[PDB]
Nucleic acid binder design. Structure first.
Ligand SMILES: O=C(c1ccc(-n2nnc3cccnc32)cc1)N(c1ncccc1Cl)[C@@H]1CCCNC1
Ligand SMILES: [Mg+2]
Ligand SMILES: [Mg+2]
Lengths: 61, 397, 26, 61, 153
RNA sequence: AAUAGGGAACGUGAGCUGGGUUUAGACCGUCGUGAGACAGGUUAGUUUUACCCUACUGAUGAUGUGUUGUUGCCAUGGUA
RNA sequence: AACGAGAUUCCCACUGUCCCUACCUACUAUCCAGCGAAACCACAGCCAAGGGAACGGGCUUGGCGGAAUCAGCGGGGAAAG
RNA sequence: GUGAACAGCCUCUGGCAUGUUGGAACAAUGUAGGUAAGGGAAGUCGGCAAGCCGGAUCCGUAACUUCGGGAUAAGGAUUG
């Protein structure tokens, strides 16, 4: 199954990336360590530019 | 006396002259021993590894927890253009071993065989086999060239085939063909020799030699690591930090009374670039590469029954350090001896096995061709600019 | 010129003592 | 063509350091013909030996 | 003066000598073996290439520690080295030999280096300063060079 | 699975470490008139050299085939 | 009590000390041009066993024994001082 | 200039050619400097070595005490 990453909203193919689980039962998907680190750096995707949630708030392409 | 704590030998003494091998092309030390009850076929084949990807497949295995689930597997792919048969060798059995009876080369020989017969193709007059091709055409040489087949048929009992690769179909720099010498294991030695007289100077593809979900050997020379120390060549333990004159050394290298260092001890030298044989590598897919121009270029590799997408197995951005695979390929589960772009010889296994891991049918579901030149996340160039959209790339119309 | 001059006597003086000490078993 | 003397004599008559003195490298043999301080003062007036001012050390920021 | 092994015909001969000159004996011995029997227009063209490092000198006798080059395969040897000072002095009096040849009236398209030997000169000393207050010598080891040239026929 | 016993100059300090022992400082106890003594206790205490020969490990090469090249065979040695 | 470059035991924090190593950087080592020593040295330098001043490199009986060398290496020379 | 500062770091006046040599290469082993997933003394005679903590402001500080101390105890919060 082909999923989406929980930080940047890009698409993860099976074989790639890393999955993360927190003690409150939430499970997250990351496709590289650039997305994995900023999630662990208590940081919100909507400010950084390359992510999909930035392309949705601002009317980008 | 008596170490107080048992521990086994570091490294194997069965590979003990850890030496730069005297060959770049892997040498088949042993072809599969035959009986004449089988139909006539080849046993070995040259190929060049391009790189690795991974895969997804619905693995059928009753008993296991792997059963009826998708499981990723590392796969290498090996670019194999068809060989071209040039020579026939005959070996007569002696009480000292095999001995080459004589050889017969083809009526007219390619450019890239002849380049292998020189150390400087530039300075050469390109003169090899020029007087040998004129005994196929004169009346006197032709009756004693086909006499050398009839004497080959009478005395020698195992025959082999000299074939080379077509380097023109490859993205490398080399343009010297690699000239192998591979054993035919057919029926009688008359049918085994007539099968090669039929098919001199002709192509032999890789699907004619090997089959899908069949298990072979891989012979090649390893990645060369250079002159490395005791703790990296032999994986010896480091000494503590407080050690004067060095950490990465083996401390004692012998007792007093054998007053002489042993071969069994570990000491520094050349690591890597050794001739090795991996056994029991399963073939996952036989490729067919970049066919006829009626439909202009059907790429169509890595397009499984569950994919149904116009893909090609060369990844997005090309194979790193290799090039771009336009030929047939064989993809093998797991890691394979050698650097990228290195000649490795595939070979049918000597032993027979059942084991339930051989003889199982593998059916693919997915091959990624994502970019290996970074943390690539797209698989075709169509897929990217659907997601990425318009850019400042075109920006004129 | 040409004819130069003599140098100096070596005048060596002893120093070290059986390397780094060391005492035998008692 | 050793100009080490005239480099020294010009730094003592221009009241400066050895670094500061002398632009124009074309009149080599003329200023090598000097050996006096009065010879070196007639080259100051003829522009062959200049003072080459202080490296800028702006207190602006 | 008198040399080693005077030539069989001093009419068609030439000779040159350099004494007490500060080169290494062990370097100059082994490039004099490299041009023994060699024609004078080939020995010059060889000796220029030793300085340019296009063609090396095989160190056969005094070879301890000498590295393995690729350019010594021509000589049938493994070890070689490119002494440019040593190939400059016996190129400097290779010119002095052919200066005497036209001065006696000889043809320099026929001169071979028949006889060239190198033997030791008296050592001259200076000193180094080593650990714990000691003195050890830096002794220079110069050489005497003599060559005999002869028209070939 | 089992946590068998040993040897190789009580293997192994130009391989290490220096805890112990085993110099010189100091403290305590017993002993001696005393200086001092005590495998009795405690504490602080410089650990040098390979570039030689062989051995071992890798690296060129040597002999022989007229020269030179490609493809090979396996004596023997290792071996999981 | 205060203070110790004093001796010791535990705990928290921290960490490649360790599991178990890996990679990068400088300076070398390495190769070249030049310049260039010293300790050391009976003769020398492949072993197994025997005998022997009881632990040979040489001697006896066996095993065997091709030039010339390079980067390392620390078993031996009961290595040097 | 920064700063509590004759600290450290950077520059001007004034000096110098990198400390008795240059080139090419970037193997081992070293010397000196870093970094490391998960665990955190399991290493070791011993937490040796390295790493943590560190400035200043606002709070807040125990046992014990020769009432002076301890005490920058400890433990937090902040900093453009
Ligand atoms: O300098 C020496 C030193 C070392 C060896 C010799 N030797 N050894 N064998 C010798 C034969 C002849 C002559 N001298 C010889 C001489 C002196 N030191 C030293 N090292 C260890 C123990 C004692 C000392 Cl004093 C110093 C101490 C301070 C730190 N740096 C080292
Ligand atoms: Mg075989
Ligand atoms: Mg391993």
């Amino acid at each position: 199954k082909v999923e989406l990453c929980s930080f940047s909203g890009y698409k993860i193919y099976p074989g790639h990336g890393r999955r993360y689980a927190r003690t409150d039962g939430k499970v997250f998907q990351f496709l590289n360590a650039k997305c994995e680190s900023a999630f662990l750096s208590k940081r919100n995707p909507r400010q950084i530019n390359w992510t999909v949630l930035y392309r949705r708030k601002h009317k980008k392409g | 006396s008596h170490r107080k704590f048992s521990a086994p030998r570091h490294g194997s003494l069965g590979f003990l002259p850890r030496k730069r091998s005297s060959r770049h092309r892997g040498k088949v030390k042993s072809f599969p021993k035959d009986d004449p009850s089988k139909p006539v076929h080849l046993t070995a084949f040259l190929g060049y590894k391009a790189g690795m990807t991974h895969i997804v497949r619905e693995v059928d295995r009753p008993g296991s927890k792997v059963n009826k689930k998708e499981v990723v597997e590392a796969v290498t792919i090996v670019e194999t253009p068809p060989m071209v048969v040039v020579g026939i060798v005959g070996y007569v059995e002696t009480p000292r071993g095999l001995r080459t009876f004589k050889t017969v080369f083809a009526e007219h020989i390619s450019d890239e065989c002849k380049r292998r017969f020189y150390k400087n193709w530039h300075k050469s007059k390109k003169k090899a086999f020029t007087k040998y091709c004129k005994k196929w055409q004169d009346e006197d040489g032709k009756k004693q060239l086909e006499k050398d087949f009839s004497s080959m048929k009478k005395y020698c009992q195992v025959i082999r085939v000299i074939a080379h690769t077509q380097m023109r179909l490859l993205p490398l720099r080399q343009k010297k063909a690699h000239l192998m010498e591979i054993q035919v294991n057919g029926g009688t030695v008359a049918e085994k020799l007539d099968w090669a007289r039929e098919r001199l100077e002709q192509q032999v593809p890789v699907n004619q030699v090997f089959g899908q979900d069949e298990m072979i050997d891989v012979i090649g020379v390893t990645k060369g690591k250079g002159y490395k120390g005791v703790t990296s060549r032999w994986h010896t333990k480091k000494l503590p930090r407080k050690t004067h004159r060095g950490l990465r050394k083996v401390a004692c290298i012998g007792a007093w009374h054998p007053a002489r260092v042993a071969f069994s001890v570990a000491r520094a030298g050349q690591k890597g670039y050794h001739h090795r044989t991996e056994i029991n590598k399963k073939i996952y897919k036989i490729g067919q590469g970049y066919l006829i121009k009626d439909g202009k270029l059907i790429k169509n590799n890595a397009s499984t029954d569950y994919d149904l997408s116009d893909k090609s197995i060369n990844p997005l951005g090309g194979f790193v350090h290799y090039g771009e695979v336009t030929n047939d390929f064989v993809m093998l589960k797991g890691c394979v001896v050698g650097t990228k772009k290195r000649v490795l010889t595939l070979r049918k296994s000597l032993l027979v096995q059942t084991k339930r891991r051989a003889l199982e049918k593998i059916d693919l579901k997915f091959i990624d061709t994502t970019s290996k030149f970074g943390h690539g996340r797209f698989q075709t160039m169509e897929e990217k600019k659907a997601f990425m959209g318009p850019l400042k790339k075109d920006r004129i119309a | 010129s040409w004819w130069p001059l003599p140098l100096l006597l070596l005048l060596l003086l002893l120093l070290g003592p059986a390397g780094a000490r060391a005492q035998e078993d008692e | 063509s050793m100009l080490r003397l005239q480099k020294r004599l010009a730094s003592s008559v221009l009241r400066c350091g050895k670094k500061k003195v002398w632009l124009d490298p074309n009149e080599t043999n003329e200023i090598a013909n000097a050996n006096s301080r009065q010879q070196i003062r007639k080259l100051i007036k003829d522009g062959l030996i200049i003072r080459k001012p202080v490296t800028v050390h702006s207190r602006a920021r | 003066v008198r040399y080693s092994l005077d030539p069989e015909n001093p009419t068609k001969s030439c000779k040159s000598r350099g004494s007490n000159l500060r080169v290494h004996f062990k370097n100059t011995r082994e490039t004099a073996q490299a041009i023994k029997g060699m024609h004078i227009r080939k020995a010059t063209k060889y000796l220029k290439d030793v300085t340019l490092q296009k063609q090396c000198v095989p160190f056969r006798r005094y070879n301890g520690g000498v590295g393995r080059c690729a350019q010594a395969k021509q000589w049938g040897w493994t070890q070689g080295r490119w002494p440019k000072k040593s190939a400059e002095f016996l190129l400097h009096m290779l010119k002095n030999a052919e200066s005497n040849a036209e001065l006696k009236g000889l043809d320099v398209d026929s001169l071979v280096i028949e006889h060239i030997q190198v033997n030791k000169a008296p050592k001259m000393r200076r000193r180094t300063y080593r650990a714990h207050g000691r003195i050890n010598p830096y002794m220079s080891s110069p050489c005497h060079i003599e060559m005999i040239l002869t028209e070939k026929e």
